[PDB]
Design a protein around this ligand. Structure first.
Ligand code: RYN
Ligand code: ZN
Ligand code: ZN
Lengths: 453, 453
């Protein structure tokens, strides 16, 4: 057993939103045994000094595109609209791939670096949607990301993505990535068989994640809806990015939401990325259907899209989580830093109603318990007995946080650095004193850097 | 002489906007002697390995309120509009002061902490606007901020501020804070005589800084205009925050800009904080007059105000710099971090015209050369022969920056940490390996933390 003792502040996000001062967290295997003051060092084989730190549930990034880690800070993609952006990324990724510079071995190391950064930013679980499946046959890309993740000890959800609707038939997808529906379903069934850990505290899970309504066939969506029921896995896709509604009506003469509902996706098995520009009247329907929504402030701003109606979703009682998206439109994997961005960026939408502005604690919940709920993990996102020992702590005693009166608010509103001090995943200490415990950071940096096209 | 050798990237912001790869910077006393490849270590007594780093001119924070470092992350002030916020801050500071908890010895230590955070964030010059002068005499608050800055060795401008317009005659402010115009003027004269260093590479300078049109008498503005001419110092005030136009119209029946014009402030001696919501017709007048503008993205968002028309100012040829404002409305002193706020936040205002969005290089220019010009410092903000050896360097070889294709864009668009690696002010190495070389980090944190009310 491991005991973290004398944490300055502990934010549980439990059902009464308890917070604790000068308290302890007790851990046994993958699970939290207790959260409270002066816990006994009974069977404890190690005590970690928590003084001067704030502890949260591990952060959960409910929307990544790991492979985009190779595409950061490209000058020609710095200031572009979505059309130019999408064009530029696919062009580069397919070009590199054709030249043998972008194989699963390269994606493995790119995933390794972005996931390591994730751990260092206090992120204990990542859901990746790998979108790059060149040739009719999707290579071992997903296996590569899963291998990086398991080597690191980070909890990992792989949402198998696709582009089953080629332009060669009214679609918008290049036929280089367009697989037959049945081939996609079959790859997924195999992934689940090899990789899925459905038990509580499972470290690798599979989700089914079409690229989106404008890019995939209704048959894929229905095929997935059926699988989700069969195997109790979750459904994930992009939702109401700008221009989507136009494309959906053009192919199906209905809204993206009407479509999803028509094809079995209006269910509590689903979590949806962005949800930037939904029709207001559809929002209560998301509520009743029980879908979850992942807020991605960085990409939404970066593409010039604007502010998703997050207050509205919360008002409706819709589950809201948080994510960074891939590093080709972020361009970092810093989930904590993005929370500050959401905290501030939303305010000018309601100049005279501060009560509607998202609070630090609401955002911190999104990034932990909210995301947990998006991924269908009731074993994550909350510091309480019986939940997973997935814990992220930050120091409060740096010169850049002097004068802070509320540590949770300080975490978002102050600081030169979002580096986590102590990070535990599945009861395993992976970061301590802001340094990787098991990973060879310098070796990973050199190996991955050598492989960037 | 000091040689920084083999910097991976050097951004000069010189007149040709030169950048260099695998290049050196040579320093002799307070000034830069050379910038280029393979510089001679002829008369060098210390060589510093710059490999894996990007070097910029030191960042210049053109707008701070250092004493607000004591008021960070206050829950009652988390989501409030300007009116409530300003009452909350004035109230607290008056209260603390009345209770003997907020005198100059306290402000000295708050300033030391925020100024050290500044150095650790790559900021090499700070302009502070201190307006808190309760009582029947002008206490030694400014003296205290200067003492902190001189101890640390950070370059410092003090804009002596005030609130001379009492609520009894239109001012939105209690007469506890109101000083006679003549007291402010007399104090400023003594500050200039005592502290001002007008020579090139001067380390302390005085500016004259009324809180703003809604808060000070026209006579103070005119007095300062004369004093700035007579003593060749600069003028600084808040400018076009929302509601200013209303108050200005009520009191004087003119716009804040016409007021400034009328009372001697339409000149190249002036720099203006925020400038969020000016009438578009006035912008060309700003340009003709030659006033500079400080962009403060974090406060503007935090207060619900929105986006200053920065592209418009740039298009007009107006000098644009950057700052953080005080830590009660930020709530950090992290200038580099706020640049990312600006890079992203401006985009949604022009969804279809990415060419209007501010670029990483434009933003970095604001935080360096642009701020230097606000502060009237031709000796700062540019890495070239004959300018001050004020230099900030960040490491590029961290795992959170793998995949970065352009280091300058990467500096803004990626990273878990904004912590500078190497910082030089006036030829003096102050930060190395992300640590103070002269200041006792832990001691300063301990001492200041004990003084926070
Ligand atoms: C009163 C005019 N404006 C203004 N003042 C401050 N600070 C003082 C009270 C130290 N902060 C801000 S942040 C928008 N605005
Ligand atoms: Zn996505
Ligand atoms: Zn100010």
């Amino acid at each position: 057993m491991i005991l973290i003792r004398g944490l300055t502040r502990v934010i549980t996000f439990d059902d009464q939103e308890r917070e604790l001062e000068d308290a302890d967290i007790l851990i046994d295997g993958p699970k939290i045994v207790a959260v409270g003051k002066d816990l006994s060092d009974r069977s404890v084989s190690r005590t970690i000094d928590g003084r001067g730190m704030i502890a949260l549930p591990g952060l959960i990034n409910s929307h990544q595109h790991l492979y985009e880690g190779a595409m950061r800070a490209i000058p020609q993609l710095e200031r572009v609209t979505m059309a130019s952006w999408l064009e530029g990324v696919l062009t580069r990724s397919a070009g590199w791939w054709r030249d043998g510079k972008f194989g699963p071995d390269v994606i493995r190391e790119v995933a390794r670096a972005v996931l390591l950064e994730s751990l260092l930013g206090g992120i204990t679980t990542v859901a990746d949607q790998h979108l790059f499946f060149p040739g009719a046959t999707a290579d071992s890309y997903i296996d590569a990301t899963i291998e990086a993740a398991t080597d690191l000890g980070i909890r990992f959800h792989a949402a198998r993505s696709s582009m089953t609707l080629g332009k060669s038939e009214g679609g918008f997808c290049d036929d280089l990535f367009v697989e037959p529906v049945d081939r996609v379903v079959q790859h997924c069934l195999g992934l689940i068989d090899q990789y899925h850990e459905p038990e509580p505290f499972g470290m690798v899970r599979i989700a089914l994640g079409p690229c989106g309504v404008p890019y995939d066939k209704p048959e894929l969506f229905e095929a997935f809806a059926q699988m989700a029921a069969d195997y109790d896995v979750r459904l994930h896709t992009h939702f109401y990015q700008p221009l989507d509604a136009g494309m959906s009506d053009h192919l199906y003469g209905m809204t993206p939401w009407r479509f999803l509902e028509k094809h079995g996706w209006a269910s509590d098995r689903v979590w949806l990325a962005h949800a930037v520009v939904p029709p207001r009247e559809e929002i209560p329907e998301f509520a009743d259907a029980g879908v979850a929504i992942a807020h991605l402030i960085a990409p939404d701003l970066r593409m010039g899209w604007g502010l998703a109606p997050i207050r509205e979703y919360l008002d409706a009682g819709i589950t809201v989580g948080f994510g960074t998206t891939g590093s080709a439109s972020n361009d970092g994997g810093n989930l904590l830093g993005d929370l500050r961005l959401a905290a501030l960026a939303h305010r000018p939408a309601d100049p005279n109603e501060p009560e509607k502005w998202l609070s630090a604690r609401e955002l911190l919940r999104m990034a932990t318990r909210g995301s947990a709920e998006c991924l269908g993990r009731p074993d994550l996102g909350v510091l309480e007995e019986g939940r997973a020992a997935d814990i992220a702590c930050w120091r409060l005693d740096g010169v850049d946080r002097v004068g802070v009166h509320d540590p949770a608010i300080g975490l978002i509103m102050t600081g030169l650095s979002d580096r986590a001090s102590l990070v535990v995943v599945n009861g395993q200490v992976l970061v301590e004193n802001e340094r990787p415990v098991l990973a060879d950071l310098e070796r990973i940096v050199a190996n991955t850097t050598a492989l960037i096209p």
